[PDB]
């Protein structure tokens, strides 16, 4: 089963009857407007192409415009597609919204990664800050040696060094849905959504057992 | 640091290849005149969207 492309829009410490407060993150649910709903009638391919959103989209290219023109006609924000399960999909006017979260207790959450600039040396990997004293040679902060000696004579792959994030996804996996609330369209999730505020996301129902 | 040997002159040229001065992709003229431009900035006659700039 597919995901809902949300928007990160709100964070609230909300009260409950029992004198306990819950920090929560608030995702505004939009309905999926289908493009073509591609299926495995044609090739070995199986995924459903969805636009949950819109833009003024006065500067877009014709290959992007005819794509919204055959869809739900909403000058779309962009093109997201999703792998699917449990048989082929109902292909027109389908309008997947708050109902997806009606039986889902826990969600995966697939982010747009985290948009923290440079992130990079020392900070991103939470390393120690070298001594700020003792006349340490042109050095008040350093990450630490990335190899060993001539015997391997190299730096091994996968070491935590430097760089920007590259803004991939980052999935927390299996964090709780507190509630879903229809007609107001609020999905309260208990954990955080990746990125700064105002970001886009995918919140997709959990994969994991 | 230092270096091992004095390096070959093909190396010195590969090393500069991305740092070379890059093409301007042609030039601008005004949409509404035969006065020459400076692209998406204002000329010596104030010309872009009229008024006046740069009375030197």
């Amino acid at each position: 089963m597919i995901g809902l492309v949300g928007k990160k829009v709100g964070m609230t410490r909300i009260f409950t009857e029992d004198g306990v407060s819950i920090p929560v993150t608030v995702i505004e649910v939009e309905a999926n407007r289908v493009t073509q709903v591609k299926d495995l009638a044609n090739d070995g391919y199986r995924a459903i192409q969805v636009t949950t959103g819109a833009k003024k989209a006065n500067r877009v290219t014709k290959p992007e415009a005819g794509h919204f023109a055959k869809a739900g006609v909403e000058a779309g924000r962009g093109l997201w597609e999703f792998r699917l399960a449990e048989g082929e999909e109902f292909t027109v006017g389908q309008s997947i919204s708050v109902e997806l979260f009606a039986d889902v207790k826990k969600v995966d959450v697939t982010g747009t990664s985290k948009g923290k600039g440079f992130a990079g040396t020392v900070k991103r990997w939470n390393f120690r800050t070298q001594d700020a004293t003792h006349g340490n040679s042109l050095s008040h902060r350093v990450p630490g040696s990335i190899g060993q000696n001539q015997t391997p004579g190299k730096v091994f792959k996968g070491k935590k060094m430097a760089g920007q994030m590259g803004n991939e996804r980052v999935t927390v996996q299996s964090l709780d849905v507190v509630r879903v609330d229809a007609e107001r369209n609020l999905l309260l999730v208990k954990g955080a959504v990746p990125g700064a505020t105002g970001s886009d996301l995918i919140v997709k129902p959990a994969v994991k057992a | 640091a230092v270096q091992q040997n004095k390096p070959t002159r093909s190396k010195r040229g590969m090393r500069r290849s991305h740092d070379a001065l890059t093409a301007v992709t042609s030039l601008s003229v005004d949409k509404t005149s035969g006065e020459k431009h400076l692209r998406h900035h204002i000329t010596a006659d104030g010309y872009y969207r009229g008024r006046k700039v740069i009375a030197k």
């Binding site: 600039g117 | 204002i42 008024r51 740069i54 009375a55 030197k56």
Partner: protein, 127 residues
């Protein structure tokens, strides 16, 4: 990085940023037209437009404030009496920055600054 921010600190400490902006704005109200760097030209726009806002109507406190941020006598006489009724009829955009080109002495990207209704201007040269 700089996420979910705006505006600018340019080249120095608060006192210098204040003193420079006083110099440059004090010069604006008397000369009508100036040239500076594009980040700097924006901070100038953002300094002068709130001084005009106080000045639309006479009001002794709004005259005191205008004398407090730029403590020069040439601007507070120009404000309110001359310059108050002029910009009275707009609600923001009393001035525009015109992106004039690069700086001759080095290259720092530059804008000419020019009042919204400015059409009378010296034709004398600048360096």
């Amino acid at each position: 990085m700089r996420h979910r921010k705006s505006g600018r600190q340019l080249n120095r400490n608060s006192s210098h940023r204040q003193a420079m902006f006083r110099n440059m704005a004090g010069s604006l109200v008397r000369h009508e037209i100036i040239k500076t760097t594009l980040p700097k030209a924006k901070e100038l726009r953002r300094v002068v437009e709130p001084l005009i806002t106080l000045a639309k109507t006479d009001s002794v406190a709004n005259r005191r404030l205008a004398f407090a941020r730029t403590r020069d006598n040439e601007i507070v006489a120009k404000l309110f009496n001359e310059l108050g009724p002029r910009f009275a009829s707009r609600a923001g955009g009393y001035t525009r920055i015109l992106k004039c080109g690069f700086r001759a002495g080095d290259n720092a990207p530059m804008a000419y600054i020019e009042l919204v209704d400015r059409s009378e201007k010296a034709e004398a040269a600048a360096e």
